[PDB]
Amino acid sequence: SGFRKMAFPSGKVEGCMVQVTCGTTTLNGLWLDDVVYCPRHVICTSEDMLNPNYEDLLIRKSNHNFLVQAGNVQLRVIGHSMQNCVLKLKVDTANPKTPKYKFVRIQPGQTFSVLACYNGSPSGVYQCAMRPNFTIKGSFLNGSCGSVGFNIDYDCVSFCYMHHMELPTGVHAGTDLEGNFYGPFVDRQTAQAAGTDTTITVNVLAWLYAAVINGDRWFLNRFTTTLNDFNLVAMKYNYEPLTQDHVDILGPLSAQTGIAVLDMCASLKELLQNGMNGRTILGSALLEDEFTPFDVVRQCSGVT
Amino acid sequence: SGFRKMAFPSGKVEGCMVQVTCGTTTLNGLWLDDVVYCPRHVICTSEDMLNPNYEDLLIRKSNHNFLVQAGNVQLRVIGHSMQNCVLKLKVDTANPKTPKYKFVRIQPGQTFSVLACYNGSPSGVYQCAMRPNFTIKGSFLNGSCGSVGFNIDYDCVSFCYMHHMELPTGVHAGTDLEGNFYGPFVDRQTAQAAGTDTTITVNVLAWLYAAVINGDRWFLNRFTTTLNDFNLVAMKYNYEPLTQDHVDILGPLSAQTGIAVLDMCASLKELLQNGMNGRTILGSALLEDEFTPFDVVRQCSGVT
Ligand SMILES: *CC(=O)Nc1nc2c(S(=O)(=O)NCCc3ccccc3)cccc2s1
Ligand SMILES: *CC(=O)Nc1nc2c(S(=O)(=O)NCCc3ccccc3)cccc2s1
């Protein structure tokens, strides 16, 4: 037993990390097959970021201006193209370490692991969630751009995120692997405020089930509620509305523990109204929302 | 910016994980060079665990009884020996994926990453600390035994932990890679209670520095304290005593932020006496103690 914020093993992604330099800007690239994916702002100087015209900036760049280095060996760039906010650098060598992969665009509330990289080198791995306001709360310093988010199903890596920027409030914005930003964010050094960061209700309930499975049960009460009654409370506390789809997804957890979803909603309702009263749940003093129902099942069953 | 509970990239360790079976027991092994390291309780049946005589149990085992599988290929066992609570299975093939490595015995308060594995397959990676009572709070289900803890310095993996057991209270005990248990724990299904789980004071202060560096400053106050005055408060709240060595280790963090160590101790003192008052620090509602001063410097500087 025991329940931890766990990231996927990062090895399959570590073998894809490369360094991309264009002029004086160095960031990370993702090498899959004979293509290197990286944020298009690799072609910008810090001055360009205020109001870049990426199409015009890219005209002044040729294949030889993109320096791609994998470890200490140089990749030969034979083509380049811009797809939305990412550059695709065609190289003459297929990455021999390319794992089975897919590009997926995740929904808010879904979790993924991030392999933070600097100069093409991995520094660490952590788990986060795509917030309902389409930001992520990561750990990204200068040079981390191009670091990627992913999930793994047995041998298939599903890439879902590429890091592009830090908003003035310290939260992070980025794209899927087709270069489309999550949310309304743009790759420009401009006023971009995030919307309300609401709590992922279905994730909190999943984590409450994980807590019961691992022995933390003090929060279980003698009450029940309805979806509409629960949602009145959820609205008041800036929690996402719970739908029947969310209830359905919690079904396997409800079955394992014998606690009906609406009874767990009544425990969550009381926790929202009364607080933790100085107590903890799974080593946390707040309600954790970055474990999906699938993460809880996966961790609680031992899927490798 | 941003500050996350980050694990080391696990790729170098993933290439060392193997499955070891002896009779009807299957757990994880660590393949480095031509040796496979695994918990000696692989030779036990669940009945044996009540009172095992490992030397007597090992007499009934030959090289051919240890089945070592790396992926889907079988390793040939040409020798076996017991070192403390670990078995060393000499195989005829050096692991071609062996990284640069060391075996280190860590001190309480030190952190490390764990690559949770089942049947020789990695399932996830997370960061934890060796508690002052020599337990770890991990996430280990049946089959996770033999999963390892490690730190990475550029290309060198320092293995520090091998998982062996779960105490009746849900906390975890294990050995270094020489097979010596951390703490007084034994590889026997017996009454083994853990001592006081005190808070790692030097780690909490390091994390308070990380919070200031990343913008969370509400807890900074107009006060200072002394080591003896602080330690009176630390004793009352089951925090480890802070020594001048701990102050010295926080020096680079004190210098970066301009906040003297004893002033940060006075902030911690007030936080202990008054609580968070419904507020959070780096997304936590409790004082986090599983980031060492070295982890804070490493994450805040971008070491790969
Ligand atoms: C994702 C990534 O690599 N971002 C980068 N940002 C910069 C910048 S910046 O946008 O001006 N932000 C600098 C923030 C900072 C860091 C350390 C001390 C003070 C301020 C400038 C240069 C390079 C990169 S890479
Ligand atoms: C570290 C590791 O692999 N531990 C294992 N423990 C067992 C046991 S046990 O010690 O009896 N614990 C079983 C706990 C449990 C799990 C699921 C449902 C109920 C109880 C038995 C068999 C195998 C392993 S591997």
Documented resolution in Å: 1.6
Q: CB of B47 within 8 A of CB of B1?
A: no
Give how far Cα A16 sits from Cα of A29, A36, A257, B82, Å: 8, 9, 40, 39
Tokens of B73: 């290929």
How far apart are alpha carbons B225 and B23 in whole angstroms?
60
One-character DSSP codes across B277-289: TT--BTTBSS---
CB contact, 8 Å: B111 with chain A? no
**Boundaries of every domain in chain A:** 1-14+100-197, 15-99, 198-301
How far apart are alpha carbons A30 and B218 in whole angstroms?
39
Tokens of B41: 């309780």
Q: Ligand 1 centroid vs B242 CA: distance in angstroms?
A: 35
Read off the DSSP letter of residue A4. Answer: -
Class of domain B1-14+100-197: mainly beta
Q: Decide: residue B3, CB within 10 A, 0-12 exposed, 13-18 middle, 19+ buried.
A: buried
Q: CB of B159 within 8 A of CB of B148?
A: yes
Residue A160: closest CA among A123, A120, A112? A112
Q: CB of A40 within 8 A of CB of A52?
A: no
Residue A85: closest CA among A131, A27, A143, A11? A27
Ligand 2 pocket member B140 (CB < 6 A): yes
Residue B5: closest CA among B207, B174, B152? B207
Q: CB of A178 within 8 A of CB of A105?
A: yes
How far apart are alpha carbons A279 and B285 in whole angstroms?
11
Residue B37: closest CA among B152, B194, B229, B176? B176
Q: Ligand 2 centroid vs B78 CA: distance in angstroms?
A: 30
How far apart are alpha carbons A158 and A105 in whole angstroms?
9
Ligand 2 pocket member B143 (CB < 6 A): yes
Residue B206: closest CA among B261, B136, B280? B261
**End-to-end CA, chain B:** 16
Whether A124 sits inside 8 A of B5 (CB atoms) is no
Q: What residues are paired with A86 via a beta bridge? A: A39, A83
Q: In this structure, how many other beta carbons lie within 10 angstroms of the beta carbon of residue A292?
A: 20
Three-state DSSP class for residue A244:
helix
Whether A285 sits inside 8 A of B275 (CB atoms) is no
How far apart are alpha carbons A286 and A276 in whole angstroms?
8
Ligand 1 pocket member A130 (CB < 6 A): no
Read off the DSSP letter of residue A8. Answer: P
Q: Which CATH superfamily is domain B198-301 in?
A: main proteinase (3clpro) structure, domain 3 (1.10.1840.10)
- B278 contacts on A by Cβ (under 8 Å): 275
Q: CB of B181 within 8 A of CB of B173?
A: yes
Whether B280 sits inside 8 A of A302 (CB atoms) is no
CB contact, 8 Å: B110 with chain A? no
Q: CB of A114 within 8 A of CB of A8?
A: no
Q: CB of B160 within 8 A of CB of B151?
A: yes
How far apart are alpha carbons A182 and A180 in whole angstroms?
7
Question: Searching chain B, which residue's CA lies closest to the CA of residue A13?
Answer: B11
B151 CA: distance to closest CA in chain A (Å): 11
Whether B7 sits inside 8 A of A125 (CB atoms) is yes
How far apart are alpha carbons B70 and A21 in whole angstroms?
38
Ligand 2 pocket member B24 (CB < 6 A): no
Query: Which of A86-116 are b and which e, b meaning 16 or more Cβ less than 10 Å from the residue's Cβ?
Result: bbbbebeeebebbbebeebebebbbbbbbbb
Q: What residues are paired with B74 via a beta bridge? A: B69
- A166 contacts on B by Cβ (under 8 Å): 1-2
Same fold flag, A1-14+100-197 and A198-301: no
Residue B207: closest CA among B303, B154, B286, B112? B286
How far apart are alpha carbons B122 and B17 in whole angstroms?
8
- B304 contacts on A by Cβ (under 8 Å): 117-119, 121-123
The enclosing H or E element of B167 equals none
Whether B9 sits inside 8 A of A275 (CB atoms) is no
Question: Searching chain B, which residue's CA lies closest to the CA of residue A8?
Answer: B124
Residue in the block written with tokens 């040939």 = B76
Most A-contacting residue of B10, B19, B121, B279 (CB-CB within 10 A), to test interface: B10
Q: Alpha-carbon torsion B196, B202, B206, B209, what sign? A: positive
Residue in the block written with tokens 């405020």 = A193
Query: Which of B61-87 are b and which e, b meaning 16 or more Cβ less than 10 Å from the residue's Cβ?
Result: eeeeebebbbeeeebebeebeeeebbb
CB contact, 8 Å: A168 with chain B? no
Task: Kindly give the interhelix angle for A261-274 and A227-236, rounded to the nearest 10 degrees.
Answer: 30
Q: Alpha-carbon torsion B15, A163, A21, A157, what sign? A: positive
Q: What residues have CB less than 8 Å from A144, skipping those under 6 apart?
A: A28, A116, A117, A118, A163, B302
Give how far Cα A179 sits from Cα of A27, A86, B111, Å: 15, 5, 36
Residues counted in chain B: 304
Q: Are strands A77-83 and B111-118 parallel, antiparallel or unpaired?
A: unpaired
Q: Are strands A121-129 and A77-83 parallel, antiparallel or unpaired?
A: unpaired
Mutate to test the pocket of ligand 1, among A142, A163, A167 (most ligand atoms within 8 A of CB): A142
In degrees, rounded to 5, the angle at the alpha carbon of residue B237 between the alpha carbons of residues B231 and B239 is 60
For ligand 1, atom 5, which residue shows the shortest CA distance?
A142
How far apart are alpha carbons B52 and B32 in whole angstroms?
28
Residues counted in chain A: 304
- A300 contacts on B by Cβ (under 8 Å): 141
In degrees, rounded to 5, the angle at the alpha carbon of residue A217 between the alpha carbons of residues A214 and A219 is 135
Q: Alpha-carbon torsion B200, B201, B202, B203, what sign? A: positive
For ligand 1, atom 22, which residue shows the shortest CA distance?
A142
Q: What residues have CB less than 8 Å from B232, skipping those under 6 apart?
A: none
Q: Which CATH architecture fits B15-99?
A: Beta Barrel (2.40)
Q: Are strands A86-91 and A77-83 parallel, antiparallel or unpaired?
A: antiparallel
For ligand 2, atom 16, which residue shows the shortest CA distance?
B142
Tokens of A156: 């298939």
Give how far Cα B111 sits from Cα of A106, A201, B32, B105, B139, Å: 32, 31, 22, 12, 15
How far apart are alpha carbons A278 and A270 in whole angstroms?
15
How far apart are alpha carbons A10 and A128 in whole angstroms?
14
Q: Alpha-carbon torsion B105, B87, A8, A214, what sign? A: negative
